[PDB]
């Protein structure tokens, strides 16, 4: 139904308050891709696609204001298959779908160029009120590579979404090309999962959280403006540099996501000398079996507050970041937005974003592997990881312009991983005896 008018989520808003601020700003695009080892064929997923989006509400909606001004979403069907109708007949516009074809196999650098049509498509602002806030490309590589781009703006898709839709192209597209009925989409439903988080708002615990949040933070600054969109430097680490990680996370008993912030929060602590650390922790706000079925953008960032105390093994160091967590994870309903609302001023520190295991995406033969473009707009900076520690990684280090150039990025980010490496390799040693040049 067309006339409906949908409650957006609490990380929709905030995406929303946020876009109102700088409203031709392309700060709130976000992206990443597929690295596809076959070749696959552009007409049928170009089908792929567009029955995709017809069955992901998300991608198929709008932003529109009540009277007030307070935004609603509105859903938007795209036409038919094979349709070119632009409006159903009661003017309702219909969310284009287009899955752009760029061939590079005849290219010096396809990859390069690949990568700098990602970062100009990134730049172009999507006005909300416009049904279908999502970019497609398939590039086509030569030696039968693809890489397939998904550009977003932020308020539609959040990095757990970005794998239900990979997941679900390829699940149409196997269908399509094996002349099978496409299996019904299996998602949730937004409605239910934003009437979730009132129901949280309403609740007790909201109270309970807020005491919580406001009492770790009652008194502190952040530490090195408005967040723009990142100056974006990956690095490549193969499973000889990354297992090392694995190793860690077993001795330890955590989970290396937990041995990353722990090093994190080590190499703040050694660059700058402060003992009371924070790093900031996305969650993916997502509570129940709907929820974690809805794509969607409802992910949350909270601070994660670090005693770092001098003499302390790394070991101790990963304690302390489960201690912390345990208290983040037990209050995680709670807006790290409206933390920041409560306590005024501008708490943050470095995002740490640990992506969690997505299976290599299966189109019949070829095998996609993702890789993020951009994760989102920062004031300082965002640290993202891709990959496990037995297949390696891709740590992305993404800066806020005004703060950083490219090379500082990566000077900071090659300084930080060689420091992980070698706490990793001996949580029992002291960190302040680590060697760091
Ligand atoms: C105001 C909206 C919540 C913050 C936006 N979230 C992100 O940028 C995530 C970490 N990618
Ligand atoms: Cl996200």
Redesign the pocket.
């Known amino acids: 139904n067309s006339s409906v008018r949908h409650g957006l989520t609490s ?1 929709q808003h ?2 929303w ?2 876009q109102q601020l700088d409203p031709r700003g392309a700060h709130y695009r ?1 992206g990443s891709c597929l690295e596809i080892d076959g070749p696959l064929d552009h007409a049928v997923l170009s089908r792929a696609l567009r029955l995709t989006v017809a069955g992901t509400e998300t991608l198929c909606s709008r932003f529109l204001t009540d009277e007030e001004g307070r935004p609603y979403r509105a859903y938007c069907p795209p036409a038919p298959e094979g349709s070119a109708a632009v409006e159903d007949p009661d003017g309702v516009p219909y969310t284009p779908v287009l899955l752009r074809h760029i061939d590079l196999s005849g290219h010096e650098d396809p990859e390069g160029e690949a990568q700098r049509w990602m970062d100009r498509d990134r730049a172009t602002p999507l006005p909300l009120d416009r049904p279908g806030l999502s970019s497609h490309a398939l590039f086509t590589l030569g030696g039968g590579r693809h890489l397939y781009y998904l550009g977003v703006h ?1 308020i539609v898709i ?2 757990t979404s970005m794998a239900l839709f990979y997941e679900r192209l390829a699940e149409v597209y196997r269908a399509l090309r094996d002349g099978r009925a496409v299996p019904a989409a299996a998602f949730g439903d937004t409605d239910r999962m934003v009437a979730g988080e009132e129901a949280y708002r309403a609740s007790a615990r909201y109270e309970r959280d807020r005491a919580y949040w406001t009492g770790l933070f009652t008194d502190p600054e952040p530490v090195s403006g408005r967040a723009l969109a990142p100056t974006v430097r990956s690095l490549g680490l193969p499973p000889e540099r990354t297992e090392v990680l694995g190793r860690a996370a077993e001795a330890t008993g955590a989970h290396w996501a937990r041995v990353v912030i722990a090093g994190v929060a080590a190499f703040l602590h050694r660059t700058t000398g402060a003992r009371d650390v924070v790093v900031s922790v ?1 969650v993916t706000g997502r509570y129940g079996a709907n929820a974690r079925i809805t794509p969607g953008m409802v ?1 949350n ?1 909270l601070p994660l507050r670090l005693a770092v105390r001098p003499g302390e093994s790394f070991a101790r160091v990963v304690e302390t970041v489960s201690e912390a967590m345990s208290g983040l994870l037990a209050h995680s309903r709670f807006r ?2 409206d933390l920041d609302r409560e306590l005024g001023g501008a708490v943050s520190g470095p ?1 740490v ?1 640990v992506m969690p295991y997505i299976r290599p995406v299966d189109f019949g033969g070829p095998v996609g592997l993702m890789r993020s473009i951009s ?3 920062t004031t300082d900076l ?1 640290i993202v990881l891709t990959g496990t520690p037995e297949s390696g990684l891709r740590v992305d280090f993404e800066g806020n312009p005004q703060v950083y150039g490219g090379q500082d990025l990566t000077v900071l980010q090659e300084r930080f991983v060689r420091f992980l490496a070698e706490l990793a390799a001996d949580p029992a040693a002291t960190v302040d005896e680590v060697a760091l040049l």
């Open positions: 990380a905030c995406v308050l946020a976000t932020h959040d990095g996305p992910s960032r790290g937005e995002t974003n994760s989102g707009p965002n």
